[PDB]
DNA sequence: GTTATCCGCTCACAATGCCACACGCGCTGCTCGG
RNA sequence: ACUGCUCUUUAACAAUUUAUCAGAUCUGUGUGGGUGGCGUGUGGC
């Protein structure tokens, strides 16, 4: 079926994003799909601030890495076992077909 | 003293899942009447499981007597049958356990919102596991007055119009749920600073009074005293809201 | 049981839980997921935490009130690592993720200890216990904290300490850590005024012999030679100077006991009212009655108990209670 | 299927209702603190609101919302408004009495289009969309049955903001309890409105509403089977704040009652 | 001119009940649809 | 040829305020439940 099966993966966190990068790839190579690599994109600076009762009148940026991977052989399978497996939470999991 | 509640509360919890079960099927006073007297059917035999021989004061057959004369149980399966009838989900099982004249143990238990407030001598009033304080106020700016209208004494209404009126320029606010007992239980909790009504009936307000005493509150007749074990005419709180309260309600007495 | 309190649903909307059992024979419903017994935690870091899983970090006991508060104690088996910068992570998020994936369950993850004296300590995650007394007949332990702290030690309705309880099994207590926590041991050396007294001058000199009691020191100070030439301090002057001021040590325990006896307040305001003798200040009193108002914060049913007050002469009482306070609605 | 913005709308809601609950078992976090004439604001409900309008911005940066806190939030299609109250009677909710909700109501070209209350601690979900009628948690809301003013019960709010009209509105009352069963005073106008939807009361009747209270219970009793309007029949009740409602023939009946003791200021 | 008066014209509105039986009741170049 | 010479032994805590002695239901498959409206015409009385 249709190739670009391709998710990016943003966090703030690094083991839980290779615990689950291998997973996925697991599935990926395990069901037949065709994985492509992760090829994390450099990890890059994102702005935080402390919104919360601050200190009377702390992370601020954080190194967020990118895990951009991509599956090209979508069997049933695959949606099965993606859908069924399921992930950590502390991850942006926008992904794109197309 | 552990017992009796005990039996109390599995009563309460046996009432409270039969009258929710009912309560989801549809319908558009049969019915209420229905499942008030099958509540009361399974509440009563339950209870004859122990010491079927203290003496039942429901609302309707006056005093089911019995051979043990040193207890009585104070008995509303269902206040403000009104909310039932219309589906309103405010509606509370009353029990009270009262000895020699005077109360002991008393149970209110909420089965929509699943309270369940409990309240005995000394051992204080508890909400499913909670030492209960009343509310906080001293005076009656920023609070709020349970009331409570005439629905069949509607004679008073006019000075009772008046109470409110004055009441109205003191207080902050109103509130009216036609449970007389949850008003009671919600004064306990400090839900709610102030109650007070015309003419209620001891089978209901039994449990109530106890619960808001228990809860470091008093209780009062319309005129101070305390009448309102045969007068009904309530007026409950912790102290300071009673006199902030009195001190401009006992002008207009006509009871 | 199995939901937790306050967690909404709404036909539709995917939902999390713990498969808890597995039923394929039962005539009924045969599967049985649940969000509320404490293994689902477990398993959730299990799904969270990379560290968790691996083996590495292994999640020894955690005790839960849903929606609440939920304590749990890990230890670690590679030295390398510890919980608060990998289990906690980073910034705290990672349990800050469990926690509202489970509705803002509050969690404390508390350092495991495998000393159960400093296991149930640490369990205690929000405290500071300087002052334990460890027995395992009963469970139970002086675990407390500072005097004002201790609400701050019990946390809301018990939590703190009621899952700590469940924790580590081990029953609890609550007193102090500071005050009153000698009473249970160090009861017998701290008297601070007589001990004190007599050492402000002692203290050249030496402490107090503390090899005999002395506490009951009426007969043990009628013994003889032996007891004064073994030690040295309490010389013959000394032992007789201080019978004198035993002689007041005595008087004063007349005079605590004279002055235990004061807070009854019989005033004008509550001696001349209408059915009050000086008798029945006392018996108002006697259940607790300080002041005038007092009197007229209680019904017949609660001023009841009195030796000697029926129904309806304290009826009377309260309406006078309520006259000279709440019916002229003056003091 | 079903309404788009309605969709998005009790997704907000959900959140925030969850946010309220979530909140509602910590009373030492929450204080009082007042605005005006003892409408308290506390933090929740600015907690409540930045998270209501944060999950709109996502669907539409470009609706021009309104809140009793933040005023009117200009967006660059101000053609659709947004109406909101995180909360509504504020007082119950400090007292922890647990009676509250949240209400979104969307309005198209100022004809109010959707709206949804929900209410967290018994969990109810009253919506409702024009053409398309008004939902309790999956059941069809056709009002009270009462036709006449005996036996009926009604629902009502006091003046205890704008005091002057006390006396005016205490009149009024004496003569309706001269016709009607029973009263009920909540203190949440949106949920009282909701209640009307569902029958459990026979009517309503409030003074001195802010027009950002009733945009999410109105369009609710009017796809309800209900009417609402002013104390006179007309429509200026979008700008007195003053609202009666409920099935036809009780209006109409509570209506020709109020008429003769309403003083002037209202008309 | 006004002011009302009446008149020619226009338009609406009524047509026994039953029965029984029979017969019949979208289309057509746009829309869609694969 | 001709932008490119060590920066120096791995994630780096959220938890928090009376208070406690923890405080019976796991059933069914008895069963109702698995062509007309209008028009027109004819004829009859
Ligand atoms: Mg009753
Ligand atoms: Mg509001």
Redesign the pocket.
Same mark, same amino acid.
């Given at each position: 079926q249709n190739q670009r099966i391709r998710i990016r993966l943003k966090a703030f966190?690094?083991?839980?994003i290779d615990q689950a990068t291998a997973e996925i790839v697991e599935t990926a190579k395990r069901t037949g799909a065709q994985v492509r690599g992760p090829i994390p994109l450099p990890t890059r600076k994102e702005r935080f601030t402390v919104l919360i009762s601050p200190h009377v009148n702390?992370?601020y940026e954080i190194?967020t890495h990118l895990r951009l991977v991509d599956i090209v052989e979508p069997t049933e399978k695959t949606v099965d076992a993606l859908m069924r497996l399921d992930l950590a939470a502390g991850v942006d999991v926008q992904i794109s077909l197309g | 003293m552990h017992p009796m509640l005990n039996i109390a509360v599995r009563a309460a919890?046996k009432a409270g899942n039969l009258i929710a079960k009912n309560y989801e099927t549809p319908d558009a006073n049969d019915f209420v009447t229905n499942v008030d007297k099958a509540a009361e059917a399974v509440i009563i035999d339950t209870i004859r499981k122990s010491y079927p021989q203290h003496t039942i004061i429901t609302e309707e057959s006056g005093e089911l007597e019995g051979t043990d004369q040193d207890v009585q149980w104070v008995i509303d399966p269902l206040d403000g049958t009104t909310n039932f009838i219309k589906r309103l989900p405010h509606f509370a099982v009353s029990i009270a356990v009262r000895i020699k004249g005077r109360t002991e143990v008393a149970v209110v238990y909420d089965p929509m919102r699943n309270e369940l407030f409990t309240a005995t001598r000394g *051992?204080g009033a *508890?909400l499913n596991?909670?030492?209960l304080?009343g509310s906080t106020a001293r005076d009656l700016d920023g609070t709020i007055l349970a009331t409570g209208f005439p629905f069949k004494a509607k004679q008073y209404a006019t000075t009772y119009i008046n109470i409110v009126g004055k009441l109205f320029n003191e207080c902050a606010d109103f509130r009216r749920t036609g449970s007389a007992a949850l008003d009671l239980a919600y004064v306990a909790a400090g839900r709610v600073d102030g109650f007070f009504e015309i003419g209620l009936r001891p089978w209901d307000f039994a449990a109530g009074e106890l619960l808001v005493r228990e809860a470091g509150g008093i209780v009062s007749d319309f005129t101070g005293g305390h009448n309102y074990m045969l007068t009904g005419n309530i007026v409950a709180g912790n102290p300071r809201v009673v006199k902030a309260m009195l001190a401009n309600m006992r002008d207009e007495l006509s009871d | 049981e199995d939901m937790l309190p306050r967690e909404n649903f709404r036909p539709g909307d995917r939902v999390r839980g713990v498969l808890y059992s597995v039923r394929p024979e039962?005539?009924?419903?045969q599967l049985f997921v649940t969000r509320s017994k404490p293994e689902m935690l477990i398993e959730l870091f299990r799904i969270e935490?990379?560290?968790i899983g691996e083996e590495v970090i292994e999640i020894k006991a955690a005790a839960r009130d849903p929606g609440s !508060?939920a304590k749990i104690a890990v230890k670690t088996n590679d030295k @390398? =690592?510890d919980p608060?910068?990998?289990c906690?992570?980073? @910034?705290?998020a @990672?349990?800050?993720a469990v926690?509202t994936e489970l509705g803002g369950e !509050?969690?404390? =993850?508390?350092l495991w200890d495998d000393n159960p004296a400093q296991f149930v300590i640490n369990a205690m995650?929000?405290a500071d216990v300087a002052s334990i007394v460890v027995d395992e007949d009963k469970h139970?332990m002086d675990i407390a904290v500072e005097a004002? $702290?201790?609400? +701050?030690? =019990?946390?809301? &309705?018990?939590q &703190?300490? !009621?899952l700590a309880? +469940?924790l580590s099994g081990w029953?609890? $207590?609550?007193?102090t850590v500071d005050d009153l926590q000698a009473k249970h041991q160090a009861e017998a050396h701290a008297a601070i005024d007589a001990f004190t007294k007599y050492l402000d001058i002692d203290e050249d000199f030496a402490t107090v012999l503390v090899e005999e009691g002395f506490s009951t020191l009426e007969e043990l100070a009628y013994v003889p030679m032996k007891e004064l030439l073994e030690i040295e301090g309490l010389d013959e002057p000394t032992v007789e100077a201080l019978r004198e001021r035993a002689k007041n040590a005595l008087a004063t325990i007349a005079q605590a006991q004279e002055e235990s006896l004061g807070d009854n307040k019989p005033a004008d305001d509550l001696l001349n009212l209408e059915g009050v003798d000086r008798d029945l200040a006392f018996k108002l009193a006697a259940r607790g009655v300080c002041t005038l108002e007092d009197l007229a914060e209680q019904g017949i049913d609660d001023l009841a108990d009195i030796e000697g007050l029926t129904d309806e002469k304290a009826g009377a009482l309260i309406m006078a209670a309520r006259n000279i306070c709440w019916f002229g609605d003056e003091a």
């Open positions: 966190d690094h083991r839980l702390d992370q190194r | 919890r *051992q *508890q596991g909670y030492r304080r | 039962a005539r009924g419903a935490v990379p560290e !508060r @390398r =690592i608060v910068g990998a906690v992570g980073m @910034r705290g @990672r349990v800050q926690s !509050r969690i404390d =993850i508390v995650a929000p139970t004002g $702290n201790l609400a +701050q030690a =019990i946390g809301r &309705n018990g &703190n300490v !009621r309880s +469940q029953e609890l $207590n609550v007193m």
